[PDB]
Write an enzyme that holds these catalytic residues in place. Structure first.
Site, PDB file in Angstrom:
ATOM      1  N   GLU B 171       0.708  -1.216   0.027  1.00  0.00           N
ATOM      2  CA  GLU B 171      -0.051   0.114  -0.058  1.00  0.00           C
ATOM      3  C   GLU B 171       0.882   1.300   0.145  1.00  0.00           C
ATOM      4  O   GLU B 171       0.788   2.066   0.789  1.00  0.00           O
ATOM      5  CB  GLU B 171      -1.178  -0.038   1.197  1.00  0.00           C
ATOM      6  CG  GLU B 171      -1.906  -0.908   1.037  1.00  0.00           C
ATOM      7  CD  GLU B 171      -2.914  -0.974   2.381  1.00  0.00           C
ATOM      8  OE1 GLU B 171      -2.794  -0.106   3.251  1.00  0.00           O
ATOM      9  OE2 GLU B 171      -3.764  -1.823   2.341  1.00  0.00           O
ATOM     10  N   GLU B 280      -5.867  -8.459  -0.504  1.00  0.00           N
ATOM     11  CA  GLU B 280      -6.280  -7.886   0.762  1.00  0.00           C
ATOM     12  C   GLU B 280      -7.826  -7.715   0.568  1.00  0.00           C
ATOM     13  O   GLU B 280      -8.425  -6.959  -0.145  1.00  0.00           O
ATOM     14  CB  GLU B 280      -5.702  -6.744   1.064  1.00  0.00           C
ATOM     15  CG  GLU B 280      -4.771  -6.908   2.236  1.00  0.00           C
ATOM     16  CD  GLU B 280      -4.477  -5.796   2.979  1.00  0.00           C
ATOM     17  OE1 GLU B 280      -5.270  -4.842   3.035  1.00  0.00           O
ATOM     18  OE2 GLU B 280      -3.165  -5.459   3.235  1.00  0.00           O
TER      19      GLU B 280
END
Lengths: 483, 483, 138
Positions: B171, B280
């Site tokens: 991320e 995710e």
């Protein structure tokens, strides 16, 4: 197995008139020698060619784009207003032509009214100006006492034109475009023109320039998706091979789904419902001069039918499309000094605009499938489409809706298909099938036998379950009363 | 309204093992007190919670992601190897916890190979080097006599770990990530780390970081699409109302289709065939401490069921996926110092993983549709999704295979669904129907009523055209023999 | 290209304690049993002025400074003290240093854009010449 199931009671979406739009650039013999030949026996008092006019009216054009194209990026609209004998003669850098300018804004607006078509004009963003664009908007649209609304009246037209579609520039991304821009520059300016035009007239709809470059599309939507209505898209295809050609339909489905998703990805754009305008499209791959007289045959005409059916399916995503171009240059209609040909591209339109509905109705369609790698366009760029159908369809309903129209294409080159059709709560009824087809896939019309590829008619017994055989390489709509 | 027709003889494309992956981050009690609890009566000799171990094996984890997550970006893998008593105690910036590093790379390959999953490890792009990632790769995958191979060998493992999946940072786009990067600087960084890691081991598979910003994605793909294998997506949803929660399944579908489209619009990546890694996903709405113990009820198990059904249908676009996370933190499994709980989210996995096939087979479905406009996630982002179905399904076959499966979902909150199902050239067979459901959409498993929601079986008969009724808010797999 | 992946400290000291690395540049295990001490020995054997290229690919300002120190320091600095400890009390006095290698090409580990190289070439040089003004930098 193939199958088609319909339900004339399950309406999925409206179908926008303007998926059937057209385009007329000052390129080659599209205007001059085209829809407008001055000295001619085949002309009327205004200079419009009467034969071409009668042919265009059978298509019933919903809207019509003008004057470009790569011509406008270099074009000052005022050059083309007022007494024809004082219009300056200009050089068109785009297509290396002298421009007499005796077909201009009034002449063009007159042509729109005569045929019944919303004008859609494109402003000049490579050589032009905010002012000039606004002045063009004032002249066409103003009802107050602004100098330009003054001048339209001065030249014979007291009532405004109310022209609702405006094209913020043409293909501003390309090296070839005069005064061409970067993604950031154009984005900034697409915003400026749109927003100011709208201040004067909040009722106009703006089409900003889009293309294949995704960064370009994204910067457009981000800067201007606050105020644009459409992002435009251009699709030309070929070449040489039947299957390679009649399948880029599905390349285009894929490419349109892309742009739609970029829109989804931008807040203000998604929020407002910015839409897609397919404001240039056609087959083009044979010719590379600047008269663009592309000899279209039936395979090209099957590509068109496929497009038009697809567009019927996704008129909600892409509610505005314009065939490039209407006459001669990449033209659906081809004219010489003493007659006209209606190409199979044209015939496709004749079949589908007549005989089709305003509301799309639920249509499941089973088909067998294939994949192709091949080529397209003049430059030969490779393309690839996997899971292209051999049979496709879209059914629709009239405003009434006591009239069902079932459009169905057969892409097969050789085998005809016997398709079991089902239409819920119907029949038995006599019904009519219109079929556009011909002998070869390379078949053309000539101004001699200008009817080798044409629309046939035949009566059929249908019912809540029936069957039909579809000729190879053909389009066909089944028309059926529901009362 | 509703229908399902299946044809076990039309194989559409395979279904990837790896859509059922999982994720084990050092976050709260997910790892310590989770899968690993040293002084525990419930643990084995090396410290694996035996109850969890067996809970996990049932779910047949295809691959296991570790160690992060926002944790990796602050993580130096060196600190996590060696005799346990000499490892340094470090402070995790990501979740403000003291990491004792007693659980590290070796322990993790032991836990992986103990449960049948392929290791998938995320390198540190925020606080670490190229060199540091490369030595990680050397330690795991080196045959020859490089220092970090030698060191794996000194610590008890002559043979390479052969770790297949490496994610290139975590991320990295987000403000919260330590050492967070701009789209351009990360795009350069992805290419580099990837590039050189594949000079050492060309057989690995590298997952690049993508997100919700289209430009972000487009830059990574333009730079690293040369060498990456996946771009990654992260989806976290909710919240609170049943429908606002389930049906974000159909928000996710749109989201993923958006991203594939991005890949199609970048040559190197399209040409190489870069796919998606949903590395995710979960429901996450009611908690935002830093142990993240979300008490998932049954609506969340239904979203999971939907997501997995959706994954089956598109595992050729998204070959790899990871529920977030396995134990405790956003956990499918919840554990305490004595027993454990299997949330309806885990149950969704029990249901689909056992009783699902490896070859997707043609599954046409007709269904009724709703339009919702809700909120989602920790922050309550508004959203809408148009034409979401009340009913979905996906049919698969074993490799051999004398076993058809039909996974189907009833999102309807109140009504059961009476559905006619067709299946080409079948009996007259019997069949078992496995169904996960509970008393109500808020149902929740407990350490003393561990069954409030659970998979139940019941025998029905199938007949190449037959009917079945699915409970409200339910997921069912229909397991039929074929021989 | 070897250099933009090289850590000079790996090739100093007793050879048996020297770490084997992976040369990304040529895809070869590097035992590092030929290193700085070994290289200078060979140089003064044949009477050639030595010319060292520094790692700007995976190395730091610090790392390069330390190399020059080891080689050219006559103070009681850690790295000079180190050269002395390993057998060489008197400095190598290397005169030609190479500020990175081929840092323009896609193939070089850690390669740079023209602006980021010029910026760094300035920075490495000025600071090396502050430790030792007599060096010549390429």
């Amino acid at each position: 197995s193939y199958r088609i199931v319909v339900d004339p009671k399950k309406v999925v979406k409206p179908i926008s008139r303007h998926i059937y739009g057209h385009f007329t650039e000052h390129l080659g013999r599209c205007i001059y020698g085209g829809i407008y030949e001055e000295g001619s026996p085949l002309s009327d008092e205004r200079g419009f060619r009467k034969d071409v006019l009668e042919a265009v009216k059978r298509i019933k054009v919903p809207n019509l784009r003008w004057p470009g194209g790569n011509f406008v990026s270099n074009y000052h609209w005022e050059d083309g207003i007022g007494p024809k004998d004082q219009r300056p003669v200009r050089f068109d850098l785009a297509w290396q032509q002298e421009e007499t300018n005796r077909f201009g804004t009034d002449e063009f607006i007159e042509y729109c009214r005569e045929i019944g078509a919303e004008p859609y004009i494109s402003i000049n963003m490579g050589t032009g100006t905010l002012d000039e664009a606004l002045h063009w908007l004032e002249y066409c649209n103003g009802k107050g006492n602004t100098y330009y609304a003054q001048l339209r009246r001065k030249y014979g037209h007291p009532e405004p034109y109310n022209v609702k579609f405006w094209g913020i520039g043409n293909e501003m991304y390309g090296e070839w475009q005069v005064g061409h821009m970067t993604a950031d520059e154009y984005a900034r300016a697409a915003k400026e023109y749109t927003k100011w035009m709208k201040v004067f007239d909040p009722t106009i709809k703006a089409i900003a320039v889009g293309c294949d470059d995704p960064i370009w599309n994204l910067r457009v939507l981000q800067e201007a998706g606050d105020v644009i209505d459409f992002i435009s898209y251009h699709f030309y295809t070929g070449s040489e091979d039947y299957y390679e050609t009649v399948s880029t339909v599905y390349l285009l489905k894929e490419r349109l789904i892309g742009v739609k998703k970029l829109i989804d990805m931008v807040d203000t754009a998604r929020k407002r419902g910015v839409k897609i305008a397919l404001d240039e499209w056609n087959v083009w791959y044979r010719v590379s001069d600047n008269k663009l007289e592309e000899p279209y045959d039936l395979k090209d005409g099957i590509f068109a039918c496929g497009v038009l059916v697809l567009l019927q399916k996704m008129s909600d995503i892409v509610p505005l499309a314009n065939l490039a171009q209407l006459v001669n240059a990449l033209g659906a209609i081809h004219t010489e000094k003493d007659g006209l040909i209606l190409t199979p591209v044209y015939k496709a339109f004749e079949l589908i605009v007549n005989h089709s509905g305003e509301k799309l109705v639920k249509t499941h369609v089973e088909s067998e499938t294939y994949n192709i790698e091949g080529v397209m366009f003049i430059n030969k760029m490779p393309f690839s489409v996997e899971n292209a159908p051999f049979l496709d369809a879209a059914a629709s309903i009239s405003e009434d809706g006591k009239k069902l129209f079932i459009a169905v294409v057969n892409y097969r080159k050789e085998d005809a298909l016997k398709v079991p059709i089902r239409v819920e709560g119907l029949g038995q009824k006599k019904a009519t099938v219109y079929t556009l087809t011909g002998p070869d896939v390379n078949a053309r019309n000539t101004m001699e036998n200008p009817n080798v590829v044409d629309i046939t008619s035949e009566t059929i017994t249908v019912d809540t379950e029936f069957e039909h055989t579809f000729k190879p390489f053909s389009c066909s709509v089944i028309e059926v009363e529901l009362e």
